[PDB]
């Protein structure tokens, strides 16, 4: 009383350091009660849960009064009087309050006369949106550089191609989030082989 599946097309996305937005598809057009749908959100790093109900006519709600860099878990129910059947759990992070940490586990390997494989890692829960491999010829050539901007955090390594042989490069790796970029650090060293 009353059993009904939850709405697919369920989206939970951050919209600020303190709010996340949840959306879903339009309603079942067969009957309503008054019809309502309810949503539950809980913190992972803390113990705080809030219960909300919003009229069935809508397709989104805006969780509020959250904290930055905190992960939350949400589920939702189609309810009559009411006893709907629960959605699956959705995970999302508020956007960060701080600059993201530098990438770590930086590894430079497989250097040839024109290429080199670089890999790294980044920490979760900082709303990091992209990684950028930047490189330039060592020193006095501080007039031009290449940036590889990887917007897919699922990626952890890239093969740099089209490098000049027997040449020395400084390589930097930044992470970018809503607040800004990695605090700059010392560049890595990379020396390509001569042409064989």
């Amino acid at each position, epitope marked *: 009383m009353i059993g009904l599946p939850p709405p697919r097309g369920l989206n939970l996305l951050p919209k600020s350091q303190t709010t996340l937005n949840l959306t879903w598809q339009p309603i079942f057009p067969s009957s309503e009660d008054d019809f309502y749908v309810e949503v539950e959100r809980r913190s992972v790093q803390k113990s705080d849960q809030q219960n909300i109900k919003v009229p069935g006519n809508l397709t989104s709600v805006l969780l509020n009064n959250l904290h930055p860099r905190e992960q939350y878990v949400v589920r939702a129910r189609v309810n009559t009087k009411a006893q709907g059947e629960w959605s699956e759990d959705l995970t999302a992070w508020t956007l960060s309050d701080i600059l993201p940490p*530098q990438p*770590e*586990n*930086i*590894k*430079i*390997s497989n250097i040839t006369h024109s290429s080199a494989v670089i*890999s790294w890692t980044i920490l979760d829960g900082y709303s990091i949106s992209s990684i950028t491999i930047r490189y330039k010829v*060592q*020193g006095k050539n501080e007039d031009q550089h290449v940036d590889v901007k990887i917007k897919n955090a699922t990626i952890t390594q890239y093969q740099l191609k089209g490098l000049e*042989p*027997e*040449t*020395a490069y400084q390589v930097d790796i930044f992470a970018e989030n809503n607040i800004g970029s990695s605090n700059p650090a*010392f560049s*890595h*060293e*990379l*020396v*390509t*082989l*001569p042409e064989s």
Partner: antibody
Amino acid sequence: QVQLQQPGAELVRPGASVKLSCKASGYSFTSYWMNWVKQRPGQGLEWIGMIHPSDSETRLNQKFMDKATLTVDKSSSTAYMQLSSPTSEDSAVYYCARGLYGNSWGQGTLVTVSA
Amino acid sequence: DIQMTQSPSSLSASLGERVSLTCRASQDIGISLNWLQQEPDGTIKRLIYATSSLDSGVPKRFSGSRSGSDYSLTISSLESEDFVDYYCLQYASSPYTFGGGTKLEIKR
């Protein structure tokens, strides 16, 4: 300030393996290759191999294939080199040095194999 | 294994003299070479990176250069603290290999 800390000396009994340590501080330990180098007293230098602390991949001078084992301990940011069945030929100073291109060096550990 | 023939193995010079050390590579190594300095107490320090780049904080009188298979460390005007040992090192191919070194001493 980058710092690679190696003990000054180790006495080693012939045949008993020894594990040399190189403690890294002042930088991201898992973001740089670590090299090991051997120097016999009054002699030249010899590259043993290197290891990347991120996943412990190692490349070794085949001359040392059956002599040295490189490992790391991430939690203490220490790199180790173990020498197996040491003989008098293994007495020497062993250095560790950070980065693909050795941009910081430890002070070296003098290993003396003697009964 | 690439061989680095470093000459001379020993060199006597005066304060304020200018001297050059040379390594010759048995095969092509490009710019993949460092110059190292060793103090009498065993301390090792990189002076030149990648054939010609002067490391931060190394006095300007040190410079590195190349010509073909020949690589040279030049000290433009010797200071009392420069009379130590020097090594080159190639890392173009594994295993990396060192020159045999140069011991500088003061001529009197």
